[PDB]
Amino acid sequence: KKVVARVEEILHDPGRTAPVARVKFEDGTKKLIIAPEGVKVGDVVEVKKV
Amino acid sequence: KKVVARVEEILHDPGRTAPVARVKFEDGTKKLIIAPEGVKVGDVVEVKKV
């Protein structure tokens, strides 16, 4: 199934640099990750194999 | 730019459940995340806004 997490906080976001975000997975687990530029609190990201 | 991380270790993987993995982002940072079922060490995942 799809692995998605909601952006809870943007912790550190330099210009032209991907931010550090704290995200919450659908099981309720919260973790720090790197997320694409432009993401904001309340957005959702997917972790997908490439 | 794209945010990708290489799967370094599968820490916990129940059947029919997404595994806990330790991944390494392109800047060298390592973090625990949830990754899709079927991912194995050496695969690459992308974090993408949906």
Residue numbers in the entry:
A (entry chain A), B (entry chain A): 6 to 55
Quote what the paper states about this structure:
Here, we study fold transition between distinct β-barrels by protein engineering and structural biology technique. Here, we discover that the previously reconstructed ancient DPBB sequence could also adopt a β-barrel fold named Double-Zeta β-barrel (DZBB), as a metamorphic protein. The DZBB fold is not found in any modern protein, although its structure shares similarities with RIFT and OB. Furthermore, the reconstructed OB fold could also be converted to the four-stranded SH3 fold by a simple circular permutation. Thus, these ancient β-barrel folds (DPBB, RIFT, OB, and SH3) could be readily interconverted by a few feasible mutations through the missing-link fold, DZBB, indicating their significantly close evolutionary relationships.
